[PDB]
C-alpha cells in the first residue's frame, strides 16, 4: 500500500499568503499525485491532478508540485474562502491512497477565556447524576488547558472536553470541561474549581 503522509495537520495561516502544503509518498509515485479539498460540511472538491493539473475553474492561485516521492500544494494569496482541510492521494497503485489532510485555520490576535462554572440542575441530580460544566469562551489560540479540583485536589478522573470549532465571525473558539458526577460524591464535597491556563496569561483563570 504506498503509505501517504501529510506531515503537519494544522496551519494558522493568515490571509493573502501562500500556504505550501506538502505530501510524500512511500513509494515513488510517477508524479501521480492529486490534491482534494474537503470543507466544513461535506464537500470534497477535486483540486489539482498529476502533481499539477488544476481541474476546471479551480481559480489559479492554487498550484502544486512534486517529483519522486515528495510533494506539496501551494496557495498564493490565502483567501478567507479556501479555509478547508486538504488531502493528497495516489492514483498509481492499488489501493489508491490518501494523505491524512492538513486542517488550516485562521490566526488572529490572542485572547482569553470568559469562564463560567455551572452546577447540577435539579433535574439531573434527581436522576443520579451531577455534571458540572465550566465553559471558557471566546478565545484564540485553540489551546486552553483546563483543570478540576474537589475540595483541594485535582479531579483527573471524570472530566470530558470538546471545543467549538472556529467562529466565523471572529475566529475565536469556545470549549466546555465537564466533570460528570453522581449526586452522591457531589454530596461528598464543597468546592469544585475549574481552573485554566492559556497562552494569554499567567494567572490561571478561575
Amino acid at each position: 500500500d504506498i503509505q501517504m503522509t501529510q506531515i503537519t495537520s494544522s496551519l494558522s495561516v493568515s490571509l493573502g499568503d501562500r500556504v505550501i502544503i506538502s505530501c510524500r509518498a512511500s513509494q515513488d509515485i510517477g508524479n501521480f499525485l492529486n490534491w482534494y479539498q474537503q470543507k466544513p460540511d461535506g464537500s470534497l472538491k477535486l483540486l489539482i491532478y498529476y502533481t499539477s493539473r488544476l481541474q476546471s475553474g479551480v481559480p489559479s492561485r492554487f498550484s502544486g508540485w512534486g517529483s519522486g516521492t515528495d510533494y506539496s500544494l501551494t496557495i498564493s494569496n490565502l483567501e478567507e474562502e479556501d479555509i478547508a482541510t486538504f488531502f493528497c492521494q495516489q492514483g498509481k497503485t492499488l489501493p489508491y491512497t490518501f494523505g491524512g489532510g492538513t486542517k488550516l485555520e485562521i490566526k488572529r490576535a490572542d485572547a482569553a477565556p470568559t469562564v463560567s462554572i455551572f452546577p447540577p440542575s435539579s433535574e439531573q441530580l434527581t436522576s443520579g447524576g451531577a455534571s458540572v460544566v465550566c465553559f471558557l469562551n471566546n478565545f484564540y489560540p485553540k489551546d486552553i488547558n483546563v483543570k478540576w479540583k474537589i475540595d483541594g485536589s485535582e479531579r483527573q478522573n471524570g472530566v470530558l472536553n470538546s471545543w467549538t470549532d472556529q467562529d466565523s465571525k471572529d475566529s475565536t473558539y469556545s470549549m466546555s470541561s465537564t466533570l460528570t458526577l453522581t449526586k452522591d460524591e457531589y454530596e461528598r464535597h464543597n468546592s469544585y474549581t475549574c481552573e485554566a491556563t492559556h497562552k494569554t496569561s499567567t494567572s490561571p483563570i478561575v
Binding site: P95, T114, S176
Partner: protein, 217 residues
C-alpha cells in the same frame, strides 16, 4: 452541474448487509467508471471498491472484497455497493464518486456526492435528555449572561440544539460532541446580556432525528 446523490444510509447492527446506491445526473454516465471512497472517523479517507466505465473491471480493496459489491446499472444511471457481513469497522461516510478521464493510468475522483453515512453498531436508539445550563440571574461576566443546555445520553446522531433567533447579541456556541460509554453528549450555550433574562424566558429546542423534541430553558 454534474450530480452524484447518495441514498442507502442507516444504522445497521453488526453482521448484516446493505446496498448503498448511487445516482448519476449530469453527464453521460456510461462514459465514466465510478469508485467508492469512505471517510471513517479519526481514521482516514479510505477508498473502497471501483467499477469500470460500463462493466469491464469491477475492482476491489483488500478491506472489503468478499463482503463488498460494486453493481453498475448504466440504462437506469445508478451505482450500487451492496454490502454483507458488515463489521463495526465499516461504520462511516460513504462517497459515491466520479472517475476522471484526464490522464495516464491516473486514478482521480473528479466528482464526489454528498456523503451517505452508515453506522454499524448494536447499541440502541436512545432519546437525548435535555438539561438547563442555568447560572441564577445576571451572572456571567457582566451585563450579559451565558446559558446552557446539556443534552446527555443520546445515540445515534444528529441530535440538534436550536436556541433563539434575536441577535442583539445572541451567540450560541455549541460544543461539538464526543462518545462516552457508548452515548453522545454535547452542549450549546448562548449569551444574552443583562436585561433580557430573567426578564423573558429563553429556551433550548432539542430534536433528535429518531423523532423526539425536548424543550427547555
Amino acid at each position: 452541474d454534474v450530480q452524484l446523490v447518495e441514498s442507502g444510509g442507516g444504522l445497521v447492527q453488526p453482521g448484516g448487509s446493505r446496498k448503498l446506491s448511487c445516482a448519476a445526473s449530469g453527464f453521460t454516465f456510461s462514459n465514466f467508471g465510478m469508485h467508492w471512497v469512505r471517510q471513517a472517523p479519526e481514521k482516514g479517507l479510505e477508498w473502497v471498491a471501483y467499477i469500470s466505465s460500463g462493466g469491464s473491471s469491477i475492482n476491489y480493496a483488500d478491506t472489503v472484497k468478499g463482503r463488498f459489491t460494486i453493481s453498475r446499472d448504466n440504462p437506469k444511471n445508478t451505482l450500487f455497493l451492496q454490502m454483507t457481513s458488515l463489521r463495526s469497522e465499516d461504520t462511516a461516510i460513504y462517497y459515491c464518486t466520479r472517475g476522471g478521464t484526464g490522464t495516464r493510468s491516473l486514478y482521480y475522483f473528479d466528482y464526489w456526492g454528498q456523503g451517505a453515512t452508515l453506522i454499524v453498531s448494536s447499541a440502541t436508539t436512545t432519546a437525548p435528555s435535555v438539561y438547563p445550563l442555568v447560572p441564577g440571574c445576571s451572572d456571567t461576566s457582566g451585563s450579559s449572561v451565558t446559558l446552557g443546555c446539556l443534552v446527555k445520553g443520546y445515540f445515534p446522531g444528529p441530535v440538534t440544539v436550536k436556541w433563539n433567533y434575536g441577535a442583539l447579541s445572541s451567540g450560541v456556541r455549541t460544543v461539538s460532541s464526543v462518545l462516552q460509554s457508548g452515548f453522545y453528549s454535547l452542549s450549546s450555550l448562548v449569551t444574552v446580556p443583562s436585561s433580557t433574562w430573567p426578564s423573558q424566558t429563553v429556551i433550548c429546542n432539542v430534536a433528535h432525528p429518531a423523532s423526539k423534541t425536548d424543550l427547555i430553558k
